[model samples]
Target: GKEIGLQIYSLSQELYKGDVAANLRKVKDMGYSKLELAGYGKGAIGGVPMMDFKKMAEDAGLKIISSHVNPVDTSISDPFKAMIFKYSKEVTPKIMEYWKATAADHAKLGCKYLIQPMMPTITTHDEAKLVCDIFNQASDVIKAEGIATGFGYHNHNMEFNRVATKEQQFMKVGDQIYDLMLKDTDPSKVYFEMDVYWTVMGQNDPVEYMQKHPDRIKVLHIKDRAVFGQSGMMNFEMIFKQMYANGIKDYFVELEQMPDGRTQFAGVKDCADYLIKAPFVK
Candidate 1:
């Protein structure tokens, strides 16, 4: 598929962390032409200079397109929930230094998109607005760096969860919190990276949301969950044919494992092989 990429995160964390270079080389050799980075590995990955890491990707014939960074100490991977307590008490950007640092690294690499991967469960309007505020504040600094860039929020299933209280039938097309964030967000400053599998898994279809929201989406995380196909059970053909034309222009093939419990390395290779042959691609 045209502009397809890999998230470069999978395989029980041991493979990528064990030998980042060798694993990424495997990613390149599997025909990935682009990448969406998870992080710069706390200043570097596996003893390689961050710049060298970027160059390594290019040398392997891959373009670094986007990166996912967390505003908190992302090294922990659980603070997404911790952030809720901080914000439930009202936090500020004094702690956002890491966000600035993340942006700086991305700017150096000439990566186009700096995306925050996920947010914790949001029930209150304050929680949703808090997220928008963080991204907007970060973008305020990032956009001035003057690289061709975009800042985005990548969603998992949580963002699509509907209200549990009594409400009208029309509101069943729910997730009002997500809607509020969209409205509160400065669209020119922030956008969304919709994960197709999780979006549908949340019981909300990506196509309709894409149609409703139009240009707010800038990227996609393409993956297969439980099953992989264009239709029958999961439908990539439907999503690929319709969603991209609206706003999404770039995407990555992010996988965890295979049907037969194979390695994530093999999982993504097989996923890419299948997507490349689909009718939607170049």
Candidate 2:
């Protein structure tokens, strides 16, 4: 609405190619004025150094405002559960070190937000509690060691799943891990980048969550089932209004699915146009 941004992952096909600069220019030409990166590795974004990447995006009339990096490799053998096995729910020093390094890199790149895109699959209330604790501690490390960049989490449908184990009378089997995360995490430290499609897939309303916890959700993943608003499932206008009303300024369009005949850039262009033309967006 304000300034359309795209999560560079939506164009993973072209972005992963040889010319990242050219791919960025292509997105800029499609009317995207901001970028949220997904490719952060070894002090570089998309194989370019952090500062270099920031300059490159700036050169193409794009502001690199945010990024998606996980706090820990959740797929790395599901070790958090082992922590639960030991009844130690605290975040490890190694992970804190990683966030420290990550925050330093992001500070160099001049990002306004640094988001944890995923966590280990929450099978129990304890695991969910562990993640919230991790977010709080990691955010503290980022703030302490790095710049004033914001730290937050991005959700998938898995977060909306009911807790498998009934750990408390207050938190029953029907209770959602997402609710626990929202309730437990420090709102001043831990914000959320709500993936609307994933939230919808989880059978929850994005607008409801936005209204419920306006300050916690600072960024958004403006995704749909397919090509932007073509799916006719999500209420993007309502989402934009609520987010903007909450004083939220950054949101990224992320398209993971497309029709049989359409290409990624074609779909990307459609998404940009959808927001650009929508009267209710701003």
Candidate 3:
């Protein structure tokens, strides 16, 4: 068994409302000592110094282990359009520039893992390859600076439904994307952060996948889901048992879109209690 952590994104709305410190305190009170920051609070509270955030979390008995930040907001057409004039090539240079900036910022904050949440959309094989190459290159730069760099691929319903036309075979987008990333990068340098709920949400088996590629799975985002009425997805308890049996470690309880409209904190508390009672760790 490995240590557990929390992805603070669950409390994003609360954080945005200017209660980040309060939220952190709540998490610590729940017995969570590790956290993964998704973004800095915005506006007047915007850009709250990372040092201050770290200090406050430490004061509350929490450690910020990993952070999720895009190299550039993918939503932005050109994040550094204004700075493009300084570089001959725009796209790659802009990417590298942003990566360096973000990496430096996170490094100063004492985060060990830097995760790029996604790549641009994947359309063609060449496009997929390009995404992989970028990850490899980025990992090289990150590891050289003594930081671990990773990417997380989330699954939606579409991932399980999408069909690859060439072979007329149903393929989960997570599997395809993960395979491409693994094929294109150095296993030692590039790793994957799996979102468990997304994997099951995409109609795939989380435990089986984790067992298949334990080395590549450096981190995990743990979450639970209700069963599909028709598809007959595996039972939640079974999946949890399998993950535990497979030597899977380092997981976080993330209550994404809670079932029956349960509170996220409540769901997380249940998961933490379950882990505490489970024999796998003890």
Candidate 4:
């Protein structure tokens, strides 16, 4: 039942500079049941190595839910995809290489899933399918490691924009590139992480899409313009109700930015409190 988690990336700067143990203690006392990690330094978080993660989480009374990672290394030579067995290559990204690099970290975490919080370049439908293939392939390796880690793709409103035809992609929900991904991607292998606020920003309803493709979506990033329930843009209860109805309980609060006059940790507390007491979140 330790599913309500904090995407520590929400306060990346604080975690790195401040006392990480103290910060994590704050998160635990604030009622966060799990931790969804995004940033790591020196092979672990807040100077905490991956092998020692369990002790940290256990001391905080929280569990490691999942991690968001870079599936491809953009820093390697040529910095992009490589050519086919070429002498000097660096144009195309090697999709599986990054995961292979981080496989050990993933194995150490042993969480249920690993999520790619954002997507890569998708200029054409063909490229879209290719990226999906990349996710599927990486997913296989993660799952094959025996940690039961399935790979998932997260989305922002950009993906909802149509595939390069001109100015408008939101006129129709079913025509956007992300919808294309759901229909064409290997659903059996690939899963989805829905950022409700961003989906609504893209001019579509999260619940509607979830109802349409209930099974493909596994994790959700719950947030609002500033806080969980303050935006008044979408009905949180309605969304959580639908998600819970579908037997989808995996989610994390990923608040990338903070509102004015609010501290990062306080905002996360508000989010946690709202979801914890929500009749639907139950």
Q: For model 4, how does the per-residue alpha-carbon lDDT over 1-282 read when each residue is reduced to its tens digit?
A: 335777888875776566666777888888888777775433676557875765767787878877777544445455245212221124234556556556556676666667777667677777777676666777777777654646778888988877755544313423678888887777778889888889999888999988998989888888788877787697888888888888887888877678586778778888888877777776
Q: Against the hidden true structure, what lDDT does model 4 obtain?
A: 0.73
Q: Count the backbone clashes (under 3 Å) in each candidate.
A: 0, 0, 1, 5
Clash-forming residue pairs, model 2: none
Mark the 10 consecutive residues where model 3 has the least summed lDDT: 81-90
Instruction: Summarize candidate 3's per-residue lDDT along 1-282 as a digit string, tens digits.
Output: 335688777654654455767867877877687888776422111356788888878888888888776555344565454322221224665667666666667767778788865445554556667766776667766665567553343333333333244654432443355566567767766777777767776666777777787777767776555222212543556656766675655555565545577666666666666656655443
Best by TM-score: 2
- The digit string of per-residue lDDT tens for model 1 on 1-282 reads 355687876444744566666766777777788888774545664346778888777877788888876656544567444332344324555435666676777788888988877675466556677766776776777776643455688888777665444453333644555677678888888888888888887777887877888778768887776324633545787788766577467888877555576667666767777877777765
TM match of model 3 to true structure: 0.76
| Winning candidate number (lDDT) | 2
- By TM-score, how accurate is candidate 4? 0.86
Which regions of candidate 1 fall more than 4 Å away from where they truly are? 11-22, 46-48, 73-85, 88-90, 147-150, 163-175, 230-232
**Winner by lDDT between candidate 3 and candidate 1:** 1
- Residue range 1-282, candidate 2, lDDT tens digits: 358889988886676576777877888899999899987866877677877878778988899888888654333566444222221345466577678888888887778888888656577777778767877888898888665644688998988888764444333456788999999998888889999899999889999999999878888899998787767699888888888888887889998856576678888998888888889886
- Global Cα RMSD, each model: 3.4, 4.0, 5.3, 4.1
TM-score of model 2 (CA atoms): 0.88
Candidate 4 residue runs with Cα over 4 Å from true position: 1-3, 74-93, 164-174
- What clash pairs does model 1 have? none
Assess every candidate by TM-score: 0.84, 0.88, 0.76, 0.86
**Worst ten-residue run, lDDT, model 2?**
79-88
Q: What C-alpha lDDT, on a 0 to 100 scale, does residue 157 get in candidate 2? A: 90
